[PDB]
């Protein structure tokens, strides 16, 4: 599927600028549930399968989900015994799991923001 996926990449990199800003900001305040996302398909082409299951059986094998599970287990073990908190080598004054530096200020901040990528899909946000 390499050539088809490249064609679709090109379609994205040519429709991206044809997308609008006002209506996009209007759409980004919508709780678009599974039905809202999978009912408005272009033609509901032919009696398709359960699209939620179809996408999820690929979704839960990836970097995103595995990183979620890793954050989970590294708060869990850390709260269970003091080896992981004491090992992650935070900057100081707490290490629950978050302030971990796997890889100066720039480095630490990038490493921490790659964990803050989960604050968006963890309900720890307030804004857009």
């Amino acid at each position: 599927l390499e050539r088809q996926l490249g064609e679709l990449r090109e379609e994205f990199n040519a429709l991206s600028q044809e997308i609008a800003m006002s209506q996009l900001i209007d759409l980004a305040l919508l709780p678009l549930d599974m039905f809202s996302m999978f009912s408005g398909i272009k033609s509901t082409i032919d009696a398709a399968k359960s699209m939620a299951t179809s996408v999820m059986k690929k979704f839960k094998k990836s970097g995103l989900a595995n990183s979620v599970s890793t954050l989970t287990d590294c708060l869990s073990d850390a709260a269970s015994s003091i080896s992981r908190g004491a090992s992650i080598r935070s900057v100081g004054s707490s290490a629950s799991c978050w302030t971990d530096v796997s890889t100066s200020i720039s480095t630490q901040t990038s490493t921490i923001s790659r964990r803050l990528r989960l604050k968006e899909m963890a309900t720890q946000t307030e804004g857009m």
């Binding site: 080896s83 004491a86 090992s87 935070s90 900057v91 100081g92 004054s93």
Partner: protein
């Protein structure tokens, strides 16, 4: 400064003596083994030399944290000063020197000896806590160089030895999974109190009052007194910095400075 603090103490007020490189630590070179055997072949412990104005501590593991949890071993040293200090300017560095070469040390009971062939790594999870009355006051994590402490009677240096998870052959051949362990992983820390201020009186690397006192006593052959030890060994005279000793020491230092203002 001395007569001024004298007049202050007489008219009770917050005094201060500004010291550069103060000899406040008694000479103490000593080790502590938390996993020992008769043959001394797999050890974990910490060794410290506290001398004058400087401290050199080092935590050693012969197994490089192979059996410990998370491939990490913890070391802690709690120095409990005899008098409080303020505005201490301190220089902290890694990889302490005098615990970094081959050594042959006798055990606690001086019965047998054991060898020590170190390999210096960096200390991770390093935490320096300056405490006063057990209440922590100043905290530093991973900050080396010139640092400050504003009020403290105790210092806590807590570092770790972490086994490198990724290792090249030349260093993997040094940390095998067997007991012989002819290379012992170490992590060191040096700490020098370059300058500070104290409400009491001490000795330094700048003033000669103590030397004038001890020279007078050695010259005129004074018997041992009830208060000061024989010869005025600063080690055994700072070990017990009782109020009587402190008063007599302030007094003799003051009159020694007074004499030094005339005859040098």
């Amino acid at each position: 400064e001395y007569i001024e603090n004298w007049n202050l103490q007489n008219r009770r007020q917050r005094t201060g003596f500004t010291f550069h490189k103060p000899n406040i630590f008694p000479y103490s070179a000593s080790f502590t083994l938390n996993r020992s055997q008769p043959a001394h072949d797999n050890l974990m412990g910490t060794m410290w030399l506290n001398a004058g104005s400087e401290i050199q501590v080092a935590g050693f593991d012969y197994s490089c944290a192979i059996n410990a949890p998370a491939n990490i071993q913890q070391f802690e040293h709690i120095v409990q000063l005899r008098r409080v200090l303020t505005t201490a300017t301190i220089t902290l560095l890694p990889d302490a020197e005098r615990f970094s070469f081959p050594r042959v040390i006798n055990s606690a009971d001086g019965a047998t000896t054991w060898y020590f062939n170190p390999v210096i790594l960096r200390p991770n999870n390093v935490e320096v806590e300056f405490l006063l009355n057990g209440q922590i006051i100043n905290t530093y994590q991973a900050r080396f160089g010139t640092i400050i402490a504003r009020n403290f009677d105790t210092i806590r240096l807590s570092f770790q030895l972490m086994r490198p998870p990724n290792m090249t052959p030349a260093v993997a051949a040094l940390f095998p999974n067997a007991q012989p362990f002819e290379h012992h992983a170490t992590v060191g820390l040096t700490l020098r109190i370059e300058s500070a201020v104290c409400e009491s009186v001490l000795a330094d690397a700048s003033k000669t009052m103590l030397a004038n006192v001890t020279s007078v006593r050695q010259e005129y052959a004074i018997p041992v007194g009830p208060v000061f030890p024989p010869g005025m060994n600063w080690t055994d005279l700072i070990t017990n910095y009782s109020p009587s000793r402190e008063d007599n020491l302030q007094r003799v230092f003051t009159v020694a400075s007074i004499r030094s203002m005339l005859v040098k």
